[PDB]
Amino acid sequence: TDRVSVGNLRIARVLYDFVNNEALPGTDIDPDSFWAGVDKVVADLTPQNQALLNARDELQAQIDKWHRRRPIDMDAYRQFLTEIGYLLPEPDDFTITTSGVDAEITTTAGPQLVVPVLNARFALNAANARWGSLYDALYGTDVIPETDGAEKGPTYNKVRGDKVIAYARKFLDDSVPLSSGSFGDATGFTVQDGQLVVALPDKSTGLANPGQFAGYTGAAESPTSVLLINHGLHIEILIDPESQVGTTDRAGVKDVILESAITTIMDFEDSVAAVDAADKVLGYRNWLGLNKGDLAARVLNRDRNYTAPGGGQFTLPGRSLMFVRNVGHLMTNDAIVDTDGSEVFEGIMDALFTGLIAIHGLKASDINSRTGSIYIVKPKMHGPAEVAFTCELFSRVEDVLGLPQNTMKIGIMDEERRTTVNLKACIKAAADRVVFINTGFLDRTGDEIHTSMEAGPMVRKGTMKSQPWILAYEDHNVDAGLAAGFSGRAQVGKGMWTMTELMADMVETKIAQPRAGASTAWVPSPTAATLHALHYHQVDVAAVQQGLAGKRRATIEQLLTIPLAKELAWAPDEIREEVDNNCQSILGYVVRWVDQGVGASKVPDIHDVALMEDRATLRISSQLLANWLRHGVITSADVRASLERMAPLVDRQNAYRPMAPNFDDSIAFLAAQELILSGAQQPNGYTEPILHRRRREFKARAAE
Ligand SMILES: O=C(O)c1ccc2cc[nH]c2c1
Numbered sequence: 001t002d003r004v005s006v007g008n009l010r011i012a013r014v015l016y017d018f019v020n021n022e023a024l025p026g027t028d029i030d031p032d033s034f035w036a037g038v039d040k041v042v043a044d045l046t047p048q049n050q051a052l053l054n055a056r057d058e059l060q061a062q063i064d065k066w067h068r069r070r071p072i073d074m075d076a077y078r079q080f081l082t083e084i085g086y087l088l089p090e091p092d093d094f095t096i097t098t099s100g101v102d103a104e105i106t107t108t109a110g111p112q113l114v115v116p117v118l119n120a121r122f123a124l125n126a127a128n129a130r131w132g133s134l135y136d137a138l139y140g141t142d143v144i145p146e147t148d149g150a151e152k153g154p155t156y157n158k159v160r161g162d163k164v165i166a167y168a169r170k171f172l173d174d175s176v177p178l179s180s181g182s183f184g185d186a187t188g189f190t191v192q193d194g195q196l197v198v199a200l201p202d203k204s205t206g207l208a209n210p211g212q213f214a215g216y217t218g219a220a221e222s223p224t225s226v227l228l229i230n231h232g233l234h235i236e237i238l239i240d241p242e243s244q245v246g247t248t249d250r251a252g253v254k255d256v257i258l259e260s261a262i263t264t265i266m267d268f269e270d271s272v273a274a275v276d277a278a279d280k281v282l283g284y285r286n287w288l289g290l291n292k293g294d295l296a297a298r299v300l301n302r303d304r305n306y307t308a309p310g311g312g313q314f315t316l317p318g319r320s321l322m323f324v325r326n327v328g329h330l331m332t333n334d335a336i337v338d339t340d341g342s343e344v345f346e347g348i349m350d351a352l353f354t355g356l357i358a359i360h361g362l363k364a365s366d367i368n369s370r371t372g373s374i375y376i377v378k379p380k381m382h383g384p385a386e387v388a389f390t391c392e393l394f395s396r397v398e399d400v401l402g403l404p405q406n407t408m409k410i411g412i413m414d415e416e417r418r419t420t421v422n423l424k425a426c427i428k429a430a431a432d433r434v435v436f437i438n439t440g441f442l443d444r445t446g447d448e449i450h451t452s453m454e455a456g457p458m459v460r461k462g463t464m465k466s467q468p469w470i471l472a473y474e475d476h477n478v479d480a481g482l483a484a485g486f487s488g489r490a491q492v493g494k495g496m497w498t499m500t501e502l503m504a505d506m507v508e509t510k511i512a513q514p515r516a517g518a519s520t521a522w523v524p525s526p527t528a529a530t531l532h533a534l535h536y537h538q539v540d541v542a543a544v545q546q547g548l549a550g551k552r553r554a555t556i557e558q559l560l561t562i563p564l565a566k567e568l569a570w571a572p573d574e575i576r577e578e579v580d581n582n583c584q585s586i587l588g589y590v591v592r593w594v595d596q597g598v599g600a601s602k603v604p605d606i607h608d609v610a611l612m613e614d615r616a617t618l619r620i621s622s623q624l625l626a627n628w629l630r631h632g633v634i635t636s637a638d639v640r641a642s643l644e645r646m647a648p649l650v651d652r653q654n655a656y657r658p659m660a661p662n663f664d665d666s667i668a669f670l671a672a673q674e675l676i677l678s679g680a681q682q683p684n685g686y687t688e689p690i691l692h693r694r695r696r697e698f699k700a701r702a703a704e
């Protein structure tokens with residue numbers, strides 16, 4: 001074949017070439033020593049990797065049987081979980097020791113943006129989303145109602161623009177209050193004796209807290225902009241009477257700029273579809289362009305220059321601080337196969353290659369962490385041993401890369417049940433590497449359903465968000481983080497807002513996350529990060545965290561409360577709706593995944609709301625239907641009929657290729673069907689083995 005032999009490994013030429021010609025040059029790592037390291041690391045860690053996955057299966061089988069032989073005793077269930085080593089002892093209190101971590105992670109609370117690394121233009125916008133226009137975010141979304149008069153048109157609408165301006169003035173009043181009066185009545189800004197002075201019609205005033213004045217641009221006498229800081233986040237008022245908006249403005253203001261996406265996660269996992277060496281290389285190459293600072297379509301932003309209150313000069317980061325999300329322990333990829341032809345573990349490969357590439361970001365670029373850290377998000381881990389394994393992998397990789405030990409820092413996803421109930425030990429296992437924990441609530445619900453598949457029928461998918469287990473899971477995660485001393489040291493993060501068009505709703509409800517003590521939470525786009533930034537100005541996360549300290553708000557019993565439905569909880573019509581809804585979302589996502597290699601896309605649901613979502617929402621839907629089928633809530637004819645019914649709608653909702661009417665001939669349709677009908681047999685309900693196989697199948701058919 002077209003592979004390169006190195007030890008026991010056979011590396012796809014496209015990857016070998018990528019590494020030698022693009023990734024390695026500029027790192028000072030000897031190419032031959034690198035490849036020897038890859039061979040050695042894969043050979044050494046592969047057995048432990050496999051045994052961990054086998055252990056998952058064995059635990060699940062025991063729980064499966066336990067439920068089959070079962071009016072539901074929690075004392076018994078809990079002592080059984082401890083017996084089989086599912087529930088492990090909680091360690092004594094400790095504080096994490098992770099050092100050399102940047103301020104964007106240790107200290108600054110704010111939005112965290114996640115983007116598919118395979119999409120270069122998306123990744124570019126994400127990195128540039130550290131600063132974003134509040135006016136654009138308000139004007140373009142439904143935050144400002146399109147009520148009579150204020151509708152978006154083909155051209156600028158002055159009625160709407162004025163509501164945007166008023167909305168921002170109120171934000172300023174709430175965030176950076178004047179000693180007296182309102183920003184709404186401002187006519188000018190000036191800096192005098194190093195102090196911000198605001199002109200109102202009748203008199204002048206300063207800030208109630210002059211500590212919020214951070215800097216300015218242009219002459220102090222008539223600044224071209226004024227820079228404020230609040231709860232550690234910057235706000236920049238652009239002052240330009242010459243501009244169109246500025247002309248209509250009372251103080252010549254052109255825009256309000258928010259520091260928005262403080263950090264960004266470049267994603268190789270659930271938001272992308274990458275099933276072979278060509279796909280991985282595309283991803284790795286974008287990740288390289290990001291770290292080298294030369295990725296272009298439009299290019300990456302430079303730092304920002306300001307004059308300090310006093311009159312000196314300083315600078316602020318122009319770009320979002322980058323994490324990379326590697327895949328988890330489950331999958332293999334044929335990017336590399338061994339002599340026997342066995343595919344190599346993809347997570348192992350990601351650590352080596354994304355780690356290698358990240359070195360560039362530590363270096364002056366013809367730039368990322370100034371403290372010398374590399375930030376890797378690791379998803380879908382089940383328990384402390386799997387966490388320890390990930391740390392051992394990073395340690396071995398650091399050795400191959402000639403990096404100081406603990407350079408490679410870990411963002412722990414809390415998105416599997418065996419991690420949730422052992423969270424303190426999982427953190428302890430990574431106490432010198434961990435830079436965040438985060439509630440991946442969607443995968444977590446998929447795992448919740450699969451783990452208790454045999455217990456009985458589960459509540460409807462929309463009911464899950466408010467079940468006792470998930471509310472406890474959220475509080476427990478924050479409690480464990482704070483108890484491990486995350487305050488001032490590491491992020492406590494919460495989940496993604498998936499309704500991309502419902503920004504009014506996001507601004508209304510997503511404030512609950514910072515109020516819950518989360519120093520960060522996930523947004524889908526630059527625009528959403530700007531709007532989500534508002535919440536951090538309203539909530540004092542540091543204070544909230546201090547108030548939460550030492551609280552223990554979720555019991556193990558609460559964590560373990562299985563979301564079983566009550567006897568006969570559903571009328572026939574509600575059942576049908578749940579089925580159609582789930583089939584619709586499965587089909588809408590899968591069709592783009594299998595046909596176009598698109599791992600994340602705005603997909604209208606049944607009620608026709610635009611949902612982003614990724615692989616995890618597929619995991620939830622397939623497991624729920626698999627659970628209902630397993631326990632006789634629905635029949636196989638129900639599933640099939642629903643799939644055939646929703647298919648044409650999906651086709652219609654959509655370079656596309658219709659699934660209907662020849663379903664048995666549609667690879668996408670059959671993948672969706674397989675996900676449901678084989679759902680119960682997928683390891684932890686994971687959708688990758690099926691998706692990957694079907695996408696490779698589609699690629700092979702397209703080729704001929
Ligand atoms: O981190 C994820 O699982 C996730 C979820 C939704 C979206 C939409 C774009 N990127 C995503 C990532």
Ligand SMILES: [Mg+2]
Pocket residue numbers: 270379415440442443616
């Ligand atoms: Mg997830």
